Amino acid sequence: AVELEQLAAYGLTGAYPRTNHSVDTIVKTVNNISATYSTIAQMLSTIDLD
Amino acid sequence: PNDEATIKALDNVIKQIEALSVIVNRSEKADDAQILGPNTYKQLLEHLFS
């Protein structure tokens, strides 16, 4: 959700997203998320799966 | 998966189960019977004439 004035100001000045990080940091973060999910799934499978 | 979280979870659940299995139920209540003591019948006043 965004209001009309903010969107108009964004579009008038021709803004675009910009970043200073590299590709590998993002994929490392995604791998961390997947690892957390895998850890929880393994714990549930070895303790709670009944 | 991180293998060190599963070990900790298993140890924690085992400790919980072991703790739950030691609680004992023992009550040493008294009885509702009342200890009785000695008593002596008392004499009401009387008048005797012939």
Side-chain angles (χ1 to χ4, degrees), chain A residues 24-44:
Chain A
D24 50 354
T25 312
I26 308 171
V27 307
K28 283 185 80 163
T29 310
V30 173
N31 288 328
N32 200 13
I33 300 172
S34 64
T36 303
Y37 268 65
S38 296
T39 300
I40 302 179
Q42 186 200 62
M43 192 272 306
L44 282 196

Side-chain angles (χ1 to χ4, degrees), chain B residues 25-45:
Chain B
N25 294 129
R26 204 171 171 280
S27 299
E28 184 178 1
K29 223 189 182 193
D31 205 63
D32 300 348
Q34 318 162 26
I35 301 313
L36 293 186
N39 202 7
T40 50
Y41 288 96
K42 301 187 307 293
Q43 37 187 349
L44 71 91
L45 66 159

